[PDB]
UniProtKB/Swiss-Prot annotation, chain A:
Core subunit of respiratory chain NADH dehydrogenase (Complex I) which is composed of 45 different subunits. This is the largest subunit of complex I and it is a component of the iron-sulfur (IP) fragment of the enzyme. Complex I associates with ubiquinol-cytochrome reductase complex (Complex III) to form supercomplexes. Interacts with MDM2 and AKAP1. Core subunit of the mitochondrial membrane respiratory chain NADH dehydrogenase (Complex I) which catalyzes electron transfer from NADH through the respiratory chain, using ubiquinone as an electron acceptor. Essential for catalysing the entry and efficient transfer of electrons within complex I. Plays a key role in the assembly and stability of complex I and participates in the association of complex I with ubiquinol-cytochrome reductase complex (Complex III) to form supercomplexes. It is found in: Mitochondrion inner membrane. It comes from Bos taurus. This is NADH-ubiquinone oxidoreductase 75 kDa subunit, mitochondrial. Belongs to the complex I 75 kDa subunit family.
UniProtKB/Swiss-Prot annotation, chain D:
Binds 1 [4Fe-4S] cluster. It comes from Bos taurus. This is NADH dehydrogenase [ubiquinone] iron-sulfur protein 7, mitochondrial. The chain holds residues 61 to 216 of 216 of the full protein. It is found in: Mitochondrion inner membrane. Coiled coil: none annotated. The keyword 4Fe-4S applies. Belongs to the complex I 20 kDa subunit family. The keyword Magnesium does not apply. The modification Hydroxyarginine is found at residue 54.
UniProtKB/Swiss-Prot annotation, chain E:
One of its GO terms (biological process) is mitochondrial respiratory chain complex I assembly. GO terms for cellular component: mitochondrial inner membrane; respiratory chain complex I. This is NADH dehydrogenase [ubiquinone] iron-sulfur protein 8, mitochondrial. Its EC number is 7.1.1.2. Keywords: 4Fe-4S, Electron transport, Iron, Iron-sulfur, Membrane, Metal-binding, Mitochondrion, Mitochondrion inner membrane, NAD, Oxidoreductase, Repeat, Respiratory chain, Transit peptide, Translocase, Transport, Ubiquinone. Its main location: mitochondrion. It comes from the Eukaryota. Its cofactor is [4Fe-4S] cluster. Residues 68-97, 107-136 form the 4Fe-4S ferredoxin-type domain. [4Fe-4S] cluster 1 binds at residues 77, 80, 83, 126. It is a peripheral membrane protein. [4Fe-4S] cluster 2 binds at residues 87, 116, 119, 122. The chain holds residues 37 to 212 of 212 of the full protein. It catalyses: a ubiquinone + NADH + 5 H(+)(in) = a ubiquinol + NAD(+) + 4 H(+)(out). It comes from Bos taurus (Bovine).
UniProtKB/Swiss-Prot annotation, chain H:
Its main location: mitochondrion. It is found in: Mitochondrion inner membrane. GO terms for biological process: mitochondrial electron transport, NADH to ubiquinone; mitochondrial respiratory chain complex I assembly; reactive oxygen species metabolic process. Coiled coil: none annotated. It catalyses: a ubiquinone + NADH + 5 H(+)(in) = a ubiquinol + NAD(+) + 4 H(+)(out). Its EC number is 7.1.1.2. Keywords: Electron transport, Membrane, Mitochondrion, Mitochondrion inner membrane, NAD, Oxidoreductase, Respiratory chain, Transit peptide, Translocase, Transport, Ubiquinone. This is NADH dehydrogenase [ubiquinone] iron-sulfur protein 3, mitochondrial. Core subunit of the mitochondrial membrane respiratory chain NADH dehydrogenase (Complex I) which catalyzes electron transfer from NADH through the respiratory chain, using ubiquinone as an electron acceptor. Essential for the catalytic activity and assembly of complex I. Core subunit of respiratory chain NADH dehydrogenase (Complex I) which is composed of 45 different subunits. Interacts with NDUFAF3. Interacts with RAB5IF. Found in subcomplexes containing subunits NDUFS2, MT-ND1 and NDUFA13. It is a peripheral membrane protein. It comes from Bos taurus. The gene is NDUFS3.
């Protein structure tokens, strides 16, 4: 039921700041040229990037390559993940290694600081299916949510 | 067994290429008549350039059956032009004189729309 | 109609209009639906 | 007098002459030609309005495009229109000529004869009844009765 | 059972040969064809005095479209889109949403009168007698745009032809 | 914002280009081609017309349904001008007349009307304004046509400072009165040319080139408040261009000189016609006026248009004047080298 | 009912009207905008509620086979009136 | 008998079955499958090499005398290797019967023209080439019959778009009718009508 938010508050034209500091519509030529000028002037640490929660892999790689060609590596995300240790070098360190369908094979599940009912509703539903059919023992470390 | 296929006219590319050249000669000799008969405003040089462009589009084909069909269709196209079954509008549909040049580069296609 | 008049209803035209094509009163088509996708309106104040 | 009076009356004379002697060249293309032949039939007898049954292109005043106009036929319909002496009018009869009709989404059909020639009157139906076509012709006479060729020339 | 149309042997007696010679020389059977057209000259013509006289029609006639109302003035259409599914020419375009009072009503109802084949399937499909083809056949326009009807035009036709549309439906619904 | 219509589609007839154009004088030669190009790409075109609606019928098939809208307007009525530009984003002015009538003179059509359109357009908030003048617009010109052109050109630039002004040479095409003018003189025996047509240099331009310049000027943001000069690629002597026309038309060529004072006398005679005069005193002055060179003004190369040689497009214009079908070639006309 | 926006253009029963700076308004210059002045949402509100003495009532829109399919409307709730899904006529139970 | 069910003619079903075996025995070299439908129509499925033999046998044999070619058409089934299916409908006036003969081809394999057997196949095969692109060998005069001159493609193929790739228009600049890429002011709306519940169990296919 969130698709109707794809019909409000949409960005439909490129916009740049005018002499009064407000955003006015412009063309793709003017907006991109104004961005390339600043990008060329700066280099290295002076260029950074942050990725949001709905960005696709195609856009992530393209932005990283563009920022690499000015010798920038500050390609950041909004969702923290500890880099101490192996960091984001081994995929097993930041994946659901058992897989969603693997919960049906588990016999003890330990939940640490997470409300999967709202973060991953269809992952919580899979836990209840094992709880209901496989008599799965579930333990939680965190606030006592239903 | 599997690659055994009944041919149309040619048994190998050498035989097929013979028909292609014969068709090319027939088209080359015909362009002056088409320009005069249809009162086209193009020149004979433009017409013969168009014939060459059409032939060079299908220069990567290596299947004799596919080439025979291309020649069979080409012969039909020549027949419609020689006998004036076509009209001045049909002949001038190879040149696209009314379609504005479509962009070819990424930036030009990026501005107009979403089609790649 | 004099012998068997039509049923009266409040929404029926009381005045009949002949064919209006070619006159200033002619029908002009248009889309009867509202705008589907609303666009974001930038703030009316500076930021820096 | 005023000058505008003489020109106003001369317009009526030539408007009356042109609408009282409409000679149509009928492009019978599909079923709509049958309903066009029933307007020439005794019941409606278009000949009694001054509208002859058929005329050759060089002496025709209005072209009635009656039936589906395919891509193959489109070049030939324009050629006949170009060779009609002026003033020339075009009546689009039926859905097929009006906008494509039943065959609107076909690969071989012109989606409306107004893509090839200007149209003065559109007669709707599939087919329009012979009386609905006669209403279009009579509606073309009134359009010609509103012409102001000389009044406009007088004010140039 | 069959019959022959042109299997005859003309008689060859002098009486018959002279009859055919008289026909060949005296043009007898051609003058007989002049007597058939002379008779028509003295008959009453079948022409009617249009527009003062009109050709007869029936209650089933399929003409210009119209959207109808209930006696209260509420629109009959409840945006079910059956007419849009059955339309063989795809001449109907419908968009709907809940109305301010919650009812199921259309926001777009267009008939492209240049795609329409005036077939009547839309009024057969309609379960509430909302969309009908009225008795008007005299709505030719001067432009192609005047024949792209929207909901306002169709509701104006209904309020314009209800007196006559209601009577025709009353005279034919028992056959439906 | 209430503009930037966001073009959609693939640039075709049923596409949307985002141009809402009011074309004044769209029922003439140049306007016929401007509307066609605007409607080809899917533009909303408003066509104010003064003539009979029958004389705009050739424009209807140029756009999709609802894309070409026709209105009545009067040159001296500001309200009619207001109705036809209050919704447009660009206004194009093609009003003009090669002769003077009893009601409109060169002051009316080339000064007052263009100024009225420019003034009303400014009040209505029209972003772009294209105005057509002549390449030979000069206040010290013998032709009253070209004098009023200069006066009006200056008055538009002040009323509408951001306006784009195009200055084309004689435009040649199927419906032109330039090549068709040097073909109907056969009706009068030989071809009279002042000084035998040796002291005049012409640089004609093709109609489609002028049309693509105007369209590119609408989409080009650099054309605001800029003056252009649309000229052909080659320069010709009036004698060797008129000779070419007859050569292409395959008509006999019998040129003979005629003094300037006598050529105006016959032009004075043809002006009595209450219909389109065959020739006039002003027409004779412009036919023999040498085309100015303005190297300091952008041409068709700055708008991305390549000028079409008169040789390529002369046959199509002059085919109808030939008397035989499938006759059976002519040599290119002599051209004045640059520098 | 029929109302006019702050530009002189009438508003349809679907709520449609061109904005002040919409170029599409040029189609009505020298012509008119077709609007039906018989808004059905208003007219159906003029119909008095029918007072019936049973829990369940049926509506066919009036006219038998000339109306709409026969539906049955529950009237148990005493806080609202049972409305017909087809024609909009409202029904109420007799005080119980 | 049920008033609403089409009655069954078992006598004619037995005759057509017997003649199907008759043809399957006399021409084993080509006949691949014979079948009779519940509404009593006989189909002979042949290898494409057997067009001239099988058709000549049915036309000339004394127990066939199928002297009229009622129709000749093609069906495009893209999921088969040989997508095209050539169908011959023949009528016998001596025995007051009808037979259908089916063969197959693909885009590049030609099929021998049957003009020698039935002269009616001349135009019927020009229409198959024009609408489906099947080539017929030794056809006296093969060329487009229905489509526009210079028209590119084969409209009746299953992968050809309904509205085609080009549309015609008159352009006032070039003073002629032109062809441009197709754009539709209203796209042909596509309806998914098939019900997700099986309707005819008798025709169910093994999984
Ligand atoms: C060949 C040489 C011809 C002689 C030279 C030309 C002079 C011809 C004069 C005769 C004109 C006849 C006009 C009759 C009009 C008529 O019958 O009624 C039509 C109409 C009425 O008929 P209606 O066509 O409008 O429709 C009536 C309704 N129905 C059709 C159902 C019956 O009357 C008009 O209002 C039109 C006016 C006609 C023009 C009158 C002004 C003439 C001015 C002449 C100026 C001098 C010229 C030199
Ligand atoms: C033998 C029997 C012969 C019967 C002849 C009867 C003639 C009846 C009187 C006719 C008078 C009008 C005829 C001319 C009509 C031409 C016309 O309508 O076109 C509009 C024409 C053209 O108007 P225009 O100037 O606006 O159009 C030209 C430019 N285009 C076409 C691109 C718009 O109007 C005129 O030219 C005025 C004609 C003169 C008016 C006075 C009549 C004098 C007749 C000669 C004496
Ligand atoms: C003792 C005195 C002796 C004196 C001489 C006696 C003369 C005896 C009579 C002589 C024979 C009669 C000759 C009649 C003319 C022959 C015509 C002929 O050749 O027919 C054969 C021809 C040909 O007939 P066929 O097509 O069957 O071919 C005959 C020859 N074969 C078969 C071998 C090919 O027929 C026609 O003439 C066709 C007629 C077409 C005309 C259609 C219009 C007719 C409408 C009727 C008009 C009436 C006119 C009245 C005018 C009045 C004016 C004031
Ligand atoms: C007011 C109007 C008053 C009537 C004006 C005269 C009308 C004449 C034409 C109609 C004739 C009626 C039809 C008729 O009876 O024809 C059948 C009859 C018979 O037609 P039949 O050809 O079918 O007869 C066949 C049988 N045999 C061969 C035996 C005749 O027509 C005639 O008999 C006409 C014969 C005389 C024609 C002489 C040639 C014309 C010479 C003109 C003078 C030179
Ligand atoms: C006098 C005409 C009548 C006549 O000939 O007498 C009747 C008689 C009976 O006729 P029939 O059936 O032929 O008898 C013999 C059959 N074996 O007829 C006969 O038996 C005669 C047999 C035919 C021989 C005479 C026919 C001569 C025809 C020549 C043309 C005459 C007209 C020439 C002038 C024409 C001018 C318009
Ligand atoms: N053609 C050429 O060679 C050259 C053209 N130009 C200029 O380009 C513009 C287009 O000229 P062009 O099309 O070739 O020639 P046209 O005479 O054929 O075009 C004239 C147009 O302007 C209209 N017009 C004339 N007077 C009036 C008036 N009082 N009120 C309203 N409209 C009027 C005409 O309307 P209507 O026909 O209905 O009366 C017509 O539509 C002109 O300004 C011209 O000076 C400049 C250089 C060369
Ligand atoms: S509009 Fe109807 S009657 Fe006319 S040609 Fe088309 S299908 Fe036939
Ligand atoms: S009459 Fe037929 S074609 Fe016309 S709108 Fe109704 S269903 Fe569609
Ligand atoms: S007109 Fe009738 S069939 Fe069409 S949507 Fe409305 S109620 Fe349904
Ligand atoms: Zn109800």
């Amino acid at each position: 039921f969130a698709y109707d938010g794809l019909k409000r508050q949409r960005l439909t034209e490129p916009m740049v700041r005018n002499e009064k500091g407000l955003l006015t519509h412009t063309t793709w030529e003017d907006a991109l040229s104004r961005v390339a000028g600043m990008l060329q002037s700066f280099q290295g640490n002076d260029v950074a990037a942050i990725a949001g929660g709905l960005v696709d892999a195609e856009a992530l790689i393209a932005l990283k390559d563009l920022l690499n060609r000015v010798d920038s590596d500050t390609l950041c995300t909004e969702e923290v993940f500890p880099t101490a240790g192996a960091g984001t070098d081994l995929r097993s360190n930041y994946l659901l290694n058992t897989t969603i369908a693997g919960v049906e094979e588990a016999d003890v599940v330990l939940l640490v600081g997470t409300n999967p009912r709202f973060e991953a509703p269809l992952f919580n539903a899979r836990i209840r299916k094992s709880w209901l059919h496989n008599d799965l023992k579930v333990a939680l470390i965190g606030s006592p949510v239903d | 067994a599997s690659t055994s296929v009944k041919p149309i006219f040619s048994r190998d590319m050498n035989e097929a290429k013979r028909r292609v050249r014969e068709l090319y000669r027939a088209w080359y000799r015909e362009v002056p008549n088409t320009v005069h008969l249809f009162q086209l405003d193009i020149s004979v040089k433009q017409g013969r350039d168009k014939v060459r462009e059409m032939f060079k589009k299908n220069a990567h084909i290596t299947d004799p059956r596919v080439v025979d069909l291309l020649v069979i269709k080409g012969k039909m196209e020549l027949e419609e032009t020689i006998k004036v079954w076509k009209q001045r509008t049909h002949v001038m549909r190879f040149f696209h004189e009314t379609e504005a040049p479509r962009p070819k580069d990424f930036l030009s296609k990026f501005y107009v729309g979403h089609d790649p | 109609p004099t012998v068997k008049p039509p049923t009266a209803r409040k929404f029926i035209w009381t005045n009949h209009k002949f064919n209006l094509s070619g006159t200033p009163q002619q029908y002009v088509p248009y889309s009867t639906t509202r705008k589907k996708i609303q666009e974001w309106v930038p703030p009316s104040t500076p930021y820096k | 007098s005023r000058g505008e009076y003489v020109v106003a009356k001369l317009d009526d004379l030539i408007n009356w002459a042109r609408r009282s002697s409409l000679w149509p060249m009928t492009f019978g293309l599909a079923c709509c030609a049958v309903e066009m032949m029933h307007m020439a039939a005794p019941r409606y007898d278009m000949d009694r309005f001054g509208v002859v049954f058929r005329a050759s292109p060089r002496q025709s005043d209005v072209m009635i495009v009656a039936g589906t106009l395919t891509n193959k036929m489109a070049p030939a319909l324009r050629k006949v229109y170009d060779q009609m002496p002026e003033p020339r009018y075009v009546v689009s009869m039926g859905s097929c000529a009006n906008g494509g009709g039943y065959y609107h989404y076909s690969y071989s059909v012109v989606r409306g004869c107004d893509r090839i020639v200007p149209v003065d009157i559109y007669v709707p139906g599939c087919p329009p009844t012979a009386e609905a076509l006669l209403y279009g012709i009579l509606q073309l006479q009134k359009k010609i009765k509103r012409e102001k060729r000389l009044r406009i020339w007088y004010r140039r | 059972t069959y019959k022959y149309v042109n299997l005859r042997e003309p008689s060859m007696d002098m009486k018959s040969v002279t009859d055919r010679a008289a026909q060949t020389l005296l043009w007898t059977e051609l003058i007989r064809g002049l007597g058939m057209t002379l008779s028509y000259l003295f008959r009453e013509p079948a022409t009617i005095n249009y527009p003062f006289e009109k050709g007869p029609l029936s209650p089933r006639f399929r003409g210009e479209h119209a959207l109808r109302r209930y006696p209260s003035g509420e629109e009959r259409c409840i945006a079910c889109k059956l007419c849009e599914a059955v339309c063989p020419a795809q001449a109907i375009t419908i968009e709907a949403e809940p109305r301010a009072d919650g009812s199921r009503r259309t926001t777009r109802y267009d008939i492209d009168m240049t795609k329409c084949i005036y077939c009547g399937f839309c009024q057969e499909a309609c379960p509430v007698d909302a969309i009908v083809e009225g008795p008007n056949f005299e709505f030719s326009t001067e432009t192609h745009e005047e024949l792209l009807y929207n909901k306002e035009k169709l509701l104006n036709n209904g309020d314009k032809w209800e007196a006559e549309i209601a009577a025709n439906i009353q005279a034919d619904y028992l056959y439906r | 914002l209430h503009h930037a219509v966001i073009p959609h589609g693939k640039g075709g007839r049923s596409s949307v280009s985002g141009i809402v154009a009011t074309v004044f004088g769209a029922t003439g030669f140049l306007g016929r081609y401007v509307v066609n190009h605007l409607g080809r790409m899917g533009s909303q075109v408003i066509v104010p017309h003064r003539c009979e609606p029958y004389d705009t019928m050739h424009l209807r098939p140029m756009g999709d349904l609802g894309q070409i809208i026709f209105m009545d307007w009067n040159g001296r009525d500001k309200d009619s001008i207001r109705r036809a530009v209050e919704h447009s984003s660009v206004v194009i002015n093609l009003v003009g007349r090669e002769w003077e009538t009893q009601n409109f003179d060169f002051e009316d059509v080339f000064v007052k009307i263009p100024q009225a359109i420019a003034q009303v357009s400014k009040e209505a908030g029209v972003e772009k304004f294209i105005h057509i003048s002549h390449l030979n617009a000069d206040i010290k010109s013998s032709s009253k046509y070209l004098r009023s052109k200069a006066v009006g050109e200056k008055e538009v630039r002040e009323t509408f400072p951001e306006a784009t002004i195009i200055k084309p040479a004689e435009i040649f095409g199927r419906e032109d009165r330039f090549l068709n003018y040097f073909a109907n003189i056969r009706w009068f025996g030989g071809v009279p040319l002042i000084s035998l047509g040796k002291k005049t240099v012409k640089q004609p331009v093709y109609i489609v080139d002028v049309t693509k310049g105007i369209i590119n000027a609408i989409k080009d943001p650099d054309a605001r408040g800029k003056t252009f000069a649309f000229v052909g690629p080659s320069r010709y002597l009036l004698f060797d261009l008129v000779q070419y026309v007859f050569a292409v038309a395959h008509r006999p060529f019998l040129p003979y000189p005629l003094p300037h004072f006598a050529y105006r006398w016959i032009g004075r005679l043809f002006e009595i016609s209450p219909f389109e005069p065959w020739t006039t005193r002003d027409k004779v002055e412009r036919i023999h006026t040498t085309d100015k060179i303005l190297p300091h003004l952008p041409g068709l190369e700055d708008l991305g248009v390549e000028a079409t040689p008169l040789e390529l497009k002369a046959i199509e214009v002059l085919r109808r004047h030939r008397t035989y079908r499938w006759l059976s070639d002519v040599q290119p006309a002599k051209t004045i080298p640059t520098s | 009912g029929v109302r006019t926006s702050p530009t002189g253009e009438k508003v349809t029963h679907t709520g449609q009207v061109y904005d002040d700076g919409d170029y599409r308004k040029v189609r009505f210059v020298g012509r008119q905008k077709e609007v039906n002045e018989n808004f059905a949402i208003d007219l159906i509100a003029e119909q008095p509620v029918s007072q019936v003495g049973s829990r369940v009532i049926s509506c066919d829109g009036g006219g038998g086979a000339l109306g709409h399919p026969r539906v049955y409307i529950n009237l148990d709730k005493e806080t609202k009136t049972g409305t017909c899904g087809y024609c909009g006529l409202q029904f109420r139970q007799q005080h119980h | 008998t049920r008033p609403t069910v089409r009655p069954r003619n078992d006598v004619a079903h037995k005759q057509l079955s017997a003649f199907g075996e008759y043809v399957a025995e006399i021409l084993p070299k080509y006949v691949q499958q014979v079948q009779v439908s519940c509404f009593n129509e006989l189909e002979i499925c042949i290898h494409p090499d057997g067009v001239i033999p099988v058709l000549t046998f049915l036309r000339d044999h004394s127990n066939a005398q199928f002297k009229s070619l009622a129709d000749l058409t093609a069906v495009d089934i893209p999921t088969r290797q040989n997508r095209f299916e050539i169908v011959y409908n023949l009528l016998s006036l001596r025995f007051n019967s009808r037979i259908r003969v089916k063969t197959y081809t693909d885009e590049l394999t030609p099929i021998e023209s049957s003009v020698p057997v039935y002269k009616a196949a001349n135009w019927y095969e020009r229409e198959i080439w024009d609408m489906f692109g099947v080539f017929f060998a030794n056809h006296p005069d093969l060329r487009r019959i229905l489509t526009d001159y210079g028209f590119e493609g084969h409209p009746f193929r299953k992968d050809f778009p309904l509205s085609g790739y080009v549309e015609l228009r008159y352009d006032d600049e070039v003073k002629r009718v032109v062809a441009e890429p197709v754009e539709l002011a209203q796209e042909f709306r596509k309806f998914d009508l098939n019900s997700p519940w099986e309707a005819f169990p008798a025709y169910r296919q093994p999984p």
